[PDB]
Design an enzyme around this catalytic site. Sequence first.
Site, PDB file in Angstrom:
ATOM      1  N   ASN A 106       0.832  -1.195   0.000  1.00 50.52           N
ATOM      2  CA  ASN A 106       0.000   0.000   0.000  1.00 50.52           C
ATOM      3  C   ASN A 106       0.873   1.254   0.000  1.00 50.52           C
ATOM      4  OD1 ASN A 106      -2.567  -1.328   0.144  1.00 50.52           O
ATOM      5  ND2 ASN A 106      -2.218  -1.691   2.334  1.00 50.52           N
ATOM      6  N   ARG A 151     -15.363  -7.068   0.188  1.00 53.28           N
ATOM      7  CA  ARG A 151     -16.153  -6.347   1.182  1.00 53.28           C
ATOM      8  C   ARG A 151     -17.542  -6.024   0.646  1.00 53.28           C
ATOM      9  NH1 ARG A 151     -11.493  -4.262   4.154  1.00 53.28           N
ATOM     10  NH2 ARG A 151     -10.764  -2.848   2.506  1.00 53.28           N
ATOM     11  N   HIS A 194      -7.418   1.759  -4.518  1.00 53.12           N
ATOM     12  CA  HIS A 194      -7.506   0.873  -3.368  1.00 53.12           C
ATOM     13  C   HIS A 194      -7.128   1.642  -2.106  1.00 53.12           C
ATOM     14  CE1 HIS A 194      -7.118  -2.789  -0.937  1.00 53.12           C
ATOM     15  NE2 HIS A 194      -5.994  -2.256  -0.491  1.00 53.12           N
ATOM     16  N   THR A 222      -4.866  -5.548   8.073  1.00 54.68           N
ATOM     17  CA  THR A 222      -5.727  -6.329   7.184  1.00 54.68           C
ATOM     18  C   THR A 222      -4.831  -7.229   6.339  1.00 54.68           C
ATOM     19  OG1 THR A 222      -5.852  -5.116   5.104  1.00 54.68           O
ATOM     20  CG2 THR A 222      -6.939  -4.149   7.016  1.00 54.68           C
TER      21      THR A 222
END
Lengths: 270, 305, 302, 275
Positions: free
Chosen positions: C112, C143, C167, C221
């Site tokens: 990320n 999700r 994202h 996560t």
Amino acid sequence: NNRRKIVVIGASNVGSAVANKIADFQLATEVVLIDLNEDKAWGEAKDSSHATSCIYSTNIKFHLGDYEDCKDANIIVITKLAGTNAKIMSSVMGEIVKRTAMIIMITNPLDVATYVVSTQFDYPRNLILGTGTMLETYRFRRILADKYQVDPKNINGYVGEHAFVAWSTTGCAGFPIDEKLSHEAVEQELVQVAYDVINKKGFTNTGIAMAACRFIKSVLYDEHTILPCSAVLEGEYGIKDMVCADGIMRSDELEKMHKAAQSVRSALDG
Amino acid sequence: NNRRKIVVIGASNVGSAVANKIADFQLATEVVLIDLNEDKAWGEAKDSSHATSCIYSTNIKFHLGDYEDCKDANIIVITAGPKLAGTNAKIMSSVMGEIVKRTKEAMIIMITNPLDVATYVVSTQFDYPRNLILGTGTMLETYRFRRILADKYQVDPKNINGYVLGEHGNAAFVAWSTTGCAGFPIDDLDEYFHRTEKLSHEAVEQELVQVAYDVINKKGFTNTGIAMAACRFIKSVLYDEHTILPCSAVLEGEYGIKDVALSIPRMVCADGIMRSFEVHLTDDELEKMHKAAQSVRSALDGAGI
Amino acid sequence: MNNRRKIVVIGASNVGSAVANKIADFQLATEVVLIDLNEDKAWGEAKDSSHATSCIYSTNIKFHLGDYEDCKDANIIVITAKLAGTNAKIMSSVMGEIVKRTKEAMIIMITNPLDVATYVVSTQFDYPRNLILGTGTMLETYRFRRILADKYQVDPKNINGYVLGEHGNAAFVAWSTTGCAGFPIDDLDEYFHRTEKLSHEAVEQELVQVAYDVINKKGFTNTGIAMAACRFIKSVLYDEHTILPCSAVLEGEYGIKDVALSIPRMVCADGIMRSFEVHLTDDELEKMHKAAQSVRSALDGA
Amino acid sequence: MNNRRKIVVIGASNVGSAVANKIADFQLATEVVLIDLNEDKAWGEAKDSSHATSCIYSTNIKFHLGDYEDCKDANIIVITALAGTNAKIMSSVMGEIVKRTKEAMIIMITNPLDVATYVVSTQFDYPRNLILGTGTMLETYRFRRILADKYQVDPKNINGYVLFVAWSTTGCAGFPIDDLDEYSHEAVEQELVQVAYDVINKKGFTNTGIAMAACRFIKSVLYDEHTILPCSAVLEGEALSIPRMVCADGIMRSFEVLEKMHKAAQSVRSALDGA
Ligand SMILES: [Cl-]
């Protein structure tokens, strides 16, 4: 190449059991079915292609093919009686060599067919492997399992011609196997079940398919597993004439081994 | 009880396929094979027990059992197959008559053909909970519809959304209104891939009928694709997934059809069919649905009932 | 040919060990190597997984600490290594070694910011563009599948559609491509007879709130993202040709260029074969452009 | 009857999450409940897992935060929550389990494994068969891997149950393990203990190996395999790990089948007396 193609020569009962299990376990990206009855191979592949379209199955490419599909094949499964089988090996093996790959042997007689493809053609010996007594091992692990209500996987050891259990190498849960049990009774229960299934079921396609998938999983994952497989002997246990990604690597009881060696030898001469 | 027992009537091509797929996917703690040819059921069960003995397969209990095993069975997959409607109607009446007399809480997965007739016989002639009765129906046609467009455009068949509804034998129509490939209309694939050959909706439907008749003749039977569909429904009830799938069962007024078994979107949960989802069909699609309802009833009436 | 499949997982942190373990549980590769700056963590994570692969039910998947030389014979290379500029430097340094040892592996981005890292490894190097992929909103799609699933007790697999955009931020639901069990998701309220009709803007906020809740409640996560990585690994290892939402440098899709965003792309054995520019509505198109404004802003800030 | 399988995972830390995720990867349950005092982290772990189960290749496994009321219809209850303070945790969580259920298979993973397993199987009136502890099952995975990496052979080939390596019941594919050196025993034992701590100091903990170990026992009970594997439980005759048959009904019977075994029993007993 991020693809894995496993070819299955012969699309009969055992042939469709091996391909279907390869799709259920998802051990190949593309599965090709070869058979003299192209209609059977196409229908089996077309029907299998529908199963692979499920939400839980990967998009395994099932389709009819020819010997040309053996070029990019990671594994090639081959699915008085000894001479006829050897004639079939001369055709399929003659075409496989013309195009190229690991070769898993299933067609029976196994020990004879595996010997024909391993000596009559110029193919790497490591790439030739037959299921061998892996089926008898599965049966041996099942016999003792149903006798004392124990997981078959606990039963250890190997089971000759695909035909004797090496009780010295067997052991359940780490200790010997041993009213009272009879070593000869277990052997008798093995030969009877081998004749009852073929007589009552008409064929043996599930066990042979699972045993083949085990070797496929070993060659695909390079597990270096020591399993009872067929391979031309070179003095092993006084008899002459590890499953990995690169094929095979290395290897009263002795009497039974030589007795089986004399049985196959008589079949090889015939 | 931490065990899940699945009984499978019929040990023939389709009955042994769904049994071995249940073992490969490990969807049962004990698989029981039942068939009039007890020799065939025992041979397939014993051979399967040898496969389960592998190092990668769980110790699934495969053996030849009787209807008594259905007493504490989680699922009962009936595949014992063979004018065609009358013969199967008598077969379904015998197998179901023995199941009701031993169990009334297991899941019934109809696979025997005619699928719509078999699902209608065991569902209306006996007092078995209707929710616990499910039929593969046109789920197999859906797999074929997904594969046809998958190979036609080289796209993952799972991306092909929608259903093939109607009869599972010959009156299986694709509801183009409920379909869609990867979030866009299926008809747009020709524009995406720049294909000058327009996608003929009729050609795809006809091709689905030819492949069904080619495999049944070329291969001689259809046990591989149908075995996977049964495992999907078995996974829906084993995992309480509440999946809205096209399964066959007696309609209760959906689209104006009653006293007839057809394949329509229905939610499959641990308790079986929870409810039905009447998706808005087009004037032409609904006409095909009614056409399929008259086809099965034309066969049901021909056999009696 | 090679009968072995080798996956490379750069970075052996939570997400790094989540992808290697999930891979091991699903059995997707013959040999999985963990390449992390903290060699002790990579060796520990690999060794711990090496014990699991020794199970009677698990294949003998090779777990061991490797270096960039292992990327030579690798089919897939998963990368799980002001924040946008910092990670961009990590991608430039990490990708700088990948391009030197191989040029045919599948690069699956997970680090990320996903969109930023995907654009860095896709434009600042000569790696084949098709062989560069990022999970992108595939996680957000899960999700979205679970939100509508738990809200109506319907199988999430029935929830079709995509979540597109960036994202972690500016992610929007492509309602024009969605639909539950063949029928529109909005029809669920009529089927189940829900007085409180479905508020589209409510699940979009929930899609962003659930992401912040897990990070604040769980601390990270790594489970959901690991599954999304395995999905793409299955798409390339099984040559599934699946059209899934993955991040990659756009080349004119929706008039967006010079930025990496998650749009419908077909994933084949050779990576991304082509893109599918779905007909996004007027509102979704703005969301697709707003996501590009955030990504380009991050790239410009680096 | 019930066509669904429900498993409860007490404690959502590394090991707990590794066990729950692998249960979802292998699809060994229909509903997974993560119970933990830190409801935040259990909810996130379950919510994050619920997203993974939303995949195309993952069954719809119901992941959510729950309480001890979920153990009522739980098929299996794993417990992934010096030796005294842990005994208080096991006694508190177990007191709540027995208060709502009496037929769920209980798997123990909390440390000390031998102590935690004996605490829950003595201070409550729960069926002994339904109790189980991973114990040395993970140690066996190490013994199989060390010999696997030592000779490049399949770890599965390696046989026998470490309980100390019980060499008297080991073997490699049916032949002596020492034969591979031709193609030591105390050295691999030292490697068997140093490697376990090296992973703890290098990775920070050990959750992957122990997670599959629990799944190995989960598959044994959910499939009634009657597999004789080494699992920690109350030791009578012959808590400590010994060869025991694992089935759907828990531990059916024991298999008796030496110096190191007595030393371990004394160490576990000494810790129990101190608690
Ligand atoms: Cl997908």
